[PDB]
Amino acid sequence: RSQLLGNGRFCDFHIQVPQKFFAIRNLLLLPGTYTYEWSFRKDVNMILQSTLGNDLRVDGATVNITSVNLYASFFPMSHNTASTLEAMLRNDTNDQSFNDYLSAANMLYPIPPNATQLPIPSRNWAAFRGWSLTRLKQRETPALGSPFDPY
Amino acid sequence: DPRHALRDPERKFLCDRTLWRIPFSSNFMSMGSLTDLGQNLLYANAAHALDMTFEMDPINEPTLLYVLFEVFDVARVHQPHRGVIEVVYLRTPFSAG
Amino acid sequence: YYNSGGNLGVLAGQSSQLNAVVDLQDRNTELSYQMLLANTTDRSRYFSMWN
Amino acid sequence: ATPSMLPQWSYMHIAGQDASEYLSPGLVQFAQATESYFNIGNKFRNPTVA
C-alpha cells in the first residue's frame, strides 16, 4: 500500500474509492436522475496507516484533495430489452433486497484494565443469530458519531 | 541435559484475526440463516432480559470489549417511478432504538 | 464517512428528495466489507484499483 | 406496507419465499437468459430458513 503511491515525503495520489454501503453497493439503479452527494474524511490518522502507531497530526502529514469525480459504467444493451427490464423492476414484487454481510449491532463496552464486565436490558430477541466477542485497545479505536476525533 | 533443572511446562494459544462465536442455536450448528432459535416462540413472543459476564486476562493499558450481536440487517429497495427511490430498512432484534 | 451521524449518503431522487441511505451508528460497514471480501474471494493477491 | 399488508420477515425476504418463486416469471426468465453476461441474480435475497 505504501509503495503503490511511491516513496518520498511528498507524493501525488490518483486513487479510486468504492462504495461499501450494503444497500447501495449492489443496487441496480433504474433510469432517472439522482443526487449522489457523499462526504470524504480528511482525518490523517484515519486516512493513512503506518507500521508504528505514531500520531500523524503531530508528525505533520495533511492531505490536499483537489478533484473528486465518480465514473459510472453502463452496460450497452438494446433499448427494447432495457425498457422491458426497467418495467419489470419498477414493480412492487420485483423489489431488490440487500443484506449487510456483517449483519450485526456493534456494541463496544469499555473495560478498566482488570477483571470482568456487564450486559443489556429487556428486548425481543427474535431472529437473533448469536454473539461475537473480541477485545480491542481503547487507544486504537476511534470515536464514531463525531466527524472528528481529537483524542 | 544429563543434568537438567526441571520442567514445569506451561501452555498457551494465540489466534489473532478471528472473532469468537457463540451461535444462537440449540445444537450450536448453523443449519440455515435464521437459526433454530429466534424462530423459537419463547424468544419471539416475549421480551427477555440478557446478562453477560466476561472474565479476562488482565492487561495494564485501558482496553475495551466489542460484542457484535449477530442479527438480520436487511434493506428492501423499491423504485416505483422514474427518479424515485424508497428503501426500507429493518434490523430485527435491535431495531433502531 | 459511513457510520458517523454527522455525515450521510444523501443519495436520493431529484424530485421527491427522500434519502435512500440511513446510518444508525451501530452498523459496521467497513468490517462488513472487509469480511465480505475475505469470504467471497481469496485475498492473498493484491489488487491495484482498491488496495 | 411493511407491518400491515405483510409480515415483516416475509416483506424483507427473511423467511418468506425463494427469489425464483416470489419474483415475476418474466423477471426470472430474463435473469436466467442474461445470467451469462449481466447476472441479475445477485440483487435478490433468499430466506434460508432453519
Binding site: 443484506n99 448469536g130 | - | 469480511m35 467471497t40 | 430466506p47
Partner: peptide, 8 residues
C-alpha cells in the same frame, strides 16, 4: 435466482 450469504 438469488443470494443468501452473510456472516454466520
Amino acid at each position: 435466482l438469488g443470494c443468501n450469504k452473510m456472516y454466520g
